[PDB]
């Protein structure tokens, strides 16, 4: 009965207890005591430098095959798990993000050892494409911020349409004078505006559209989650349709679901020949984990339908597949769920969709 | 003012000799990188750093960029993993490395092919970084430019699958010239496998970037004889000469720092525990001893000391070309 360690960097000491519970339940279910999993974990440290050292001294030193990481927004890391994506990425040790949804972690050139139990904000275009198929929309307007986040949401939507259905507009972020682009949009002759921006950049687009009278009547606003949360929600058109990722902020659910995937990937890993143990510590070890690249390929190729957050499969770049969203619609200053994205189709809810300013429709047929 | 210098045992360093702090560091692991820099910053108010390792680890560059973004210390990658091409550097970092971009090396490679009219070729890459960029620039240049070419499509593969899963993809190449892009570690497996298929013979031409050649002082046994490559490690460009070429980038940037502000930003207190201006502005356009030592927002060198090399039958690299004069290359007329 050999020992196989699973690393984790969580936010609270209480979440560590759930992590050890998830590993314990992983050993009760199908482990057969053929391989015993251990739960090595530390609470997230504010200091980035101090966090990167705690990976080496507490996690890497315990010969961890993979590291889980949740990143709520208390301190100093740019709100992105960079100091652990690099440290474990030095040895090709798979890092599994639980909460972070930044589209920059999809590129396996910057984070070649990173996975996600949550989809990036760019994969919300999978709902936009299905919603265009639902209402047979063939001419939409795509307004995206000019960053790697908005460029990702644009490329994902176009690749879903490729395999001339949209004219795209861009704008320099941080600007508070985007009337030149909406005037560009108001003459583009299309009623479906798809916006992809930050919470503050959405407020700029919303109130700038309030001037040119594009906030109601013959217009359809379809957005994601950052555009209907926080300040953007307060200035959001009445009748706007945004998305809310189901179980996107449930750290406890993502913990028990990630452990379930790792355990299944760990056991099918040890059905292969020539396996080497993960590096014991950082100091004195300058080469990658020879089994690392193979184990990451196993993790991404894994399929776990009985997940607590739905079917758990991973993308070519390690992003999560089959993630289910909630289709909200702002009605009288209140976000109303008019349906959910099942994962393969759009489930039509009992409530009714209120368009901007006095007409109605539904997610039926 | 104070400048640290961390180098390895490569290219025969012994005594390096404003104030300079030198040390021989053969620990290129994440903690030691964080430790020895923070241990310098605290107890030796270094205002800049010239780093160099003896490994081929691409990740060291990614760690120095992370350390520089947290310590606000200008770091210069001079040799080894710290000069290896990496994803674009952090915009908030002061980490720069002596190395040609992916694009510059690509142009050089194509320039060699144009010289010998190698119009028909193939492309073989792995998912390793630069895989997105390398084909685009190459695909863009050939398609847009007017000349005769046969890309023969792009062959990509994963160097972690079962062996002979790599082979089936490999037997699909129909070109004398083959452009191979991956890490040095991956390249070993690829070329080892291709050798058995007879694709490493002299009737074929494998061209690899500086990612694959890596240190021009460590040649694996699997690298086939006659391997054409571009690399910035010039073994006559002395390591000892590099730091003096790197010190000039910092001192001339710090001197300028008294202009448009007359104070040098003191080093941070400590990396541990609970930046008015950046020298970043002053290092992208440095001139020193007729050498345009200049960098870009991306972080790679503007005038990169890139050299065309081939693997000799004697198992030693040898220079058979030059670049970095200005635009254009200077082959030696032998193939």
């Amino acid at each position, epitope marked *: 009965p050999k020992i196989v360690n699973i690393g984790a960097v969580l936010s609270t000491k209480k979440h560590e*207890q759930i992590f*050890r519970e998830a590993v314990n339940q992983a050993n009760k279910r199908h482990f057969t005591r053929k391989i015993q999993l251990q739960a090595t974990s530390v609470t997230h440290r*504010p*200091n980035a430098i101090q966090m990167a050292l*705690s990976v080496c*001294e*507490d996690l890497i030193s315990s010969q961890v095959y993979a590291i889980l990481v949740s990143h709520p927004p208390a301190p100093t890391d740019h709100l992105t798990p960079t100091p652990i994506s690099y440290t474990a990425g030095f040895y090709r040790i798979p890092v599994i993000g639980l909460t972070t949804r930044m589209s920059i972690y999809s590129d396996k050139s910057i984070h070649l050892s990173f996975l996600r139990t949550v989809p990036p904000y760019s994969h919300q275009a999978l709902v936009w494409f299905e919603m265009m198929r639902l209402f047979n929309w063939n001419h939409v307007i795509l307004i995206v911020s000019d960053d790697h986040e908005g460029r990702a949401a644009q490329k994902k939507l176009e690749t879903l349409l490729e395999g001339k259905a949209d004219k795209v507009l861009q704008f320099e972020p941080g600007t508070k004078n985007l009337t030149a682009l909406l005037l560009e949009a108001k003459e583009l002759e299309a009623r479906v505006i798809i916006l992809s921006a930050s919470e503050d950049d959405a407020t700029a687009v919303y109130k700038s559209a309030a001037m040119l009278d594009m906030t109601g009547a013959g217009y359809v606003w379809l957005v994601g989650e950052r555009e209907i949360s926080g300040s953007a929600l307060r200035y959001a058109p009445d009748g706007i349709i945004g998305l809310q990722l189901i179980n996107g902020k449930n750290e406890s659910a993502h913990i028990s679901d990630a452990v379930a995937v790792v355990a299944q990937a760990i056991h099918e890993l040890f059905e292969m020949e020539n396996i080497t143990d993960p590096p014991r510590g950082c100091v004195g070890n300058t080469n990658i984990w020879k089994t690392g690249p193979l184990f990451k390929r196993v993790l991404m190729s894994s399929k776990y339908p009985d997940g607590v957050t739905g079917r758990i499969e991973f993308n070519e770049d390690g992003d999560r597949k089959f993630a289910q969203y909630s289709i909200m619609n702002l009605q009288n200053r209140k976000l109303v769920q008019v349906g959910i994205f099942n994962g393969s189709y759009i489930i039509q809810n009992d409530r009714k969709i209120i368009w901007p300013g006095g007409e109605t429709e539904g997610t039926l047929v | 003012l104070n400048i640290a210098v961390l180098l390895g045992h490569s290219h025969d360093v012994t005594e390096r000799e404003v104030n300079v702090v030198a040390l021989l560091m053969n620990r290129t692991d994440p903690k030691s990188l964080i430790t020895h820099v923070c241990d310098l910053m605290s107890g030796a108010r270094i205002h800049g750093l010239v780093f160099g390792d003896d490994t081929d680890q691409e990740a060291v560059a990614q760690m120095l960029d992370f350390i520089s973004s947290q310590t606000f210390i200008p770091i210069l990658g001079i040799h080894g993993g710290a000069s290896m091409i990496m994803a674009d550097k952090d915009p908030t970092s002061t980490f720069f490395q002596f190395g040609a971009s992916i694009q510059q090396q690509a142009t050089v490679m194509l320039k060699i092919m144009q010289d010998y009219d190698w119009h028909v070729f193939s492309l073989v890459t792995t998912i390793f970084p630069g895989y997105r960029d390398f084909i685009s620039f190459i695909k863009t240049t050939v398609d847009n430019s007017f000349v005769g070419w046969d890309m023969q499509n792009v062959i990509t593969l994963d160097t972690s699958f079962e062996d002979a899963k790599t082979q089936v993809q490999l037997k699909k190449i129909h070109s004398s010239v083959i452009l191979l892009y991956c890490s040095k570690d991956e390249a070993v497996l690829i070329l080892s496998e291709a050798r058995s298929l007879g694709l490493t013979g002299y009737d074929f031409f494998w061209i690899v970037p500086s990612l694959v050649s890596g240190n021009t002082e460590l040649i694996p046994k699997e690298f086939p004889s006659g391997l054409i490559s571009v690399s910035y490690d010039d073994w006559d460009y002395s390591l000892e000469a590099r730091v003096r070429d790197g010190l000039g980038i910092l001192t001339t940037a710090a001197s300028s720092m008294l202009e448009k502000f007359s104070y040098i930003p003191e080093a941070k207190a400590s990396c*541990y525990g*609970q930046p008015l201006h950046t020298l970043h502005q002053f290092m992208v356009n440095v001139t020193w001893d007729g050498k345009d030592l200049s960098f870009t927002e991306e972080g790679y060198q503007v005038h990169p000391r890139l050299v065309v090399i081939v693997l000799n039958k004697d198992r030693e690299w040898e220079k058979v070309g030059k670049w970095e004069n200005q635009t254009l290359s200077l082959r030696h007329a032998v193939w």
Partner: antibody, heavy 119, light 102 residues
Framework: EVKLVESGPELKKPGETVKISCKAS????????MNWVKQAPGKGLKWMGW????????TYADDFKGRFAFSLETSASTAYLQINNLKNEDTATYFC????????????WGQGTTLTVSS | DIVMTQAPATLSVTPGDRVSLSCRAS??????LYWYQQKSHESPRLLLK??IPSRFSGSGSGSDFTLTINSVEPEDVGMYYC?????????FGGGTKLEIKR
């Protein structure tokens, strides 16, 4: 290569003041907490208190309040222990233990400083 | 305060047998129960965290915990404490001295 070295044994008459040191070497000091345990000769293990390092926040036990202090010098990587108004019942061996994760278990102990409060 | 009671506080296991010690908490400490080992004249050493140091096994939860030596080596003679890490004040068990037959 993690080691915790304490100051040697000390003898101080009842009523005096003593300070003991725990020298940390091998780990990131601010990444852990320091725990102080006292062992009377054969009596057992009594936990005295825990001190966070990122935040110099002492957390003493109710029985060790008033005349027990947890000093801290992170620049020299050392946690101290000051005891005022020495009573004869303080004749014990005092350990310093690194707290894994700042509140967790004690994965590394010092060699043990032996105090003898006699006259 | 939580009272960590460990009984029996004495054992005399034959070499190669399987030792099973017992640590019962006054209340419920969940899994925050660490085990320690004290050599004759040395500081106590952390054996198990959260329930050669490969012969030691740690089962138990809530208020009933057991540490188990599968194949007792003669170099395992010493004391064995259990620590409530759940709630302040941190309390230790009564301890159990493990002598062996010969």
């Amino acid at each position: 290569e993690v080691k915790l070295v304490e100051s040697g044994p000390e003898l101080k008459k009842p009523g005096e003041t003593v300070k003991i040191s725990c020298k940390a070497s091998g780990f990131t000091f601010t990444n852990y907490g320091m725990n102080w345990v006292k062992q009377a000769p054969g009596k057992g293990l009594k936990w005295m208190g825990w001190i966070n390092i990122y935040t110099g926040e002492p957390t003493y036990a109710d029985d060790f309040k008033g005349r027990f202090a947890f000093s801290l010098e992170t620049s020299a990587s050392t946690a101290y222990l000051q005891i005022n108004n020495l009573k004869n019942e303080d004749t014990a061996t005092y350990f310093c233990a690194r707290g894994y994760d700042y509140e967790g278990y004690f994965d590394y102990w010092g060699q043990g400083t032996t105090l003898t409060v006699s006259s | 305060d939580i009272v960590m009671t460990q009984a029996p506080a004495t054992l005399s296991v034959t070499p190669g047998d399987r030792v099973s010690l017992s640590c019962r908490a006054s209340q419920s400490i969940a899994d925050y129960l660490y085990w320690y080992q004290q050599k004759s004249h040395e500081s106590p050493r952390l054996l198990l965290k959260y329930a050669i140091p490969s012969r030691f096994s740690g089962s138990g939860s809530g208020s009933d915990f057991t540490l188990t030596i599968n194949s007792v080596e003669p170099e395992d003679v010493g004391m064995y404490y259990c620590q409530n890490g759940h709630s302040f004040p941190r309390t230790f068990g009564g301890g159990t001295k493990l002598e062996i037959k010969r």
